[PDB]
């Protein structure tokens, strides 16, 4: 019933963030889930916000900043902050730290605005920077709100003597600019509100059965349910299969099964599902669809 | 001879960045390396720049923002950007700005760069090892000095033009450029890349090695971690080892201008000082 953790509302894009520690399979799960959604008839966009993109390696397809068709109903984007800058200036250094998260938030605004997709899936950077991304809207909201407030105060002062001294300011134009800033703020705030709406946005946590991943994600889940991001599902990836006759495997599997117990105890309030480690690398559409089919069942 | 890739100049801090894709073992290798340097008599600081810190989990010790003793000759830091900010303001248009900036995207990389500035100055450690964030944000860190330089400059001329401490901002600008020189100086600074024998780690790290070129970062060594040992001989292991061994050949081909070393996958998780020392010893030999 992991597949039931995805809700859809006709005409309102569903958002899903796939997150977790480095190397646990975020990109693998994102690409498999997106392919599954596409086969299910959902118009799907999967977007990589990791500045070292891997979605293209994972699907084995060239993918750009603008939506790239992968297959019927599946489109993909690897965010390029240089291009994101251009699309910003045009609307109203592309290499400074923080730019990747600002450009990722811009993508969220775009698709929230158009509602062109049934579901948008974010393939996120490793934990620490994705928590920055997810807390960025509230910060952007406060900042824009403060700029507007200050700008209004300076305006009030500036025109306070128009009845005593010649005041040459253009109030019309000033009022339009304030109105434009307020509309930008309303957009930022609307997005913060969609992100913490469990009916629109969810976060699926990927872990592997190893303590360093478990502990990181346990800290992350706490930080998430602080920001009111709905984090309802945990996927345990790279689980060694029973078919392990050898002594090296047996030691590792025995330890993984104890970690699975810890996982089910630490995330006891969540739905937990497993994805087995394959005999080969998880890479390539056919392999990704088989992972999706075992996790979610056959596409509807 | 992998250990020969670490050059030391007494009185002058050696810098090492350990980088790579998520999950490949940067923290494990950083911590194993740091313990080895310390056992070897080098006064060693290992600094996590990954905003989700794992050094504490790896070394199994509580570590703070303040250098934290781990063993003789070894200290550790998990950067806390808020403490870095009050520290930085210690040396309401601004207040709200500082508190907001202290939680904003990019603050982690700025705070990491501040650590570099602090120790390149006071050569107090023989070696400082950066346990970096995964590839993509570590590139932002490594290109940050050029951006900082330009930015401070722009800020300079703009403060002047405004009239109604330019002597200080001006110093920090030279500090920044002195740091770039240290960073691109192969006698002082190196980058070790960690990869696992899987295509997604290989391609990401090949691309990253190219972006470091542009920055003149000296990358001289590749560590291939989590290599399945030969003993494993069940059907499942053999199939995986056979693939890894083809990936090792690709790694050696693609990083042919670098020295390549392997670290075996253990039968348990790599963590705790005892296990980490075994890894350093298998990788670098006994200390001195
Ligand atoms: N279930 C699996 N079985 C086998 N290999 C896997 C599995 N899931 C992920 N991988 C491999 O593990 C590595 C990390 O997966 P990746 O999706 O890149 O992770 P992240 O996006 O979290 O960095 C890749 O080499 C991928 O092929
Ligand atoms: N050689 C190894 N053998 C077994 N487990 C390992 C080995 N190297 C690392 N690990 C395990 O792999 C996972 C990731 O290692 P970690 O150092 O956190 O990576 P990164 O810093 O690149 O995120 C951890 O659970 C760690 O214990
Ligand atoms: F997943 Al990491 F450093 F913890 F890349
Ligand atoms: F290592 Al990644 F997404 F590639 F965490
Ligand atoms: K990546
Ligand atoms: K981490
Ligand atoms: Mg990924
Ligand atoms: Mg790490
Ligand atoms: Zn085996």
Swiss-Prot record, chain B:
Enzyme Commission number: 7.3.2.7
Pfam family, one: ArsA_ATPase
Family membership: Belongs to the arsA ATPase family.
Binding site for ATP: 20-27
Keywords from the named record: Arsenical resistance, ATP-binding, Nucleotide-binding, Translocase
Function: Anion-transporting ATPase. Catalyzes the extrusion of arsenite.
Listed PANTHER family: ARSENICAL PUMP-DRIVING ATPASE ARSENITE-TRANSLOCATING ATPASE, ATPASE GET3
Protein name per its UniProtKB record: Putative arsenical pump-driving ATPase
CDD domains referenced in this protein's UniProt entry, alphabetically: ArsA
GO molecular function annotations of the record: ATP binding; ATP hydrolysis activity; ATPase-coupled arsenite transmembrane transporter activity
Catalytic activity: arsenite(in) + ATP + H2O = arsenite(out) + ADP + phosphate + H(+)
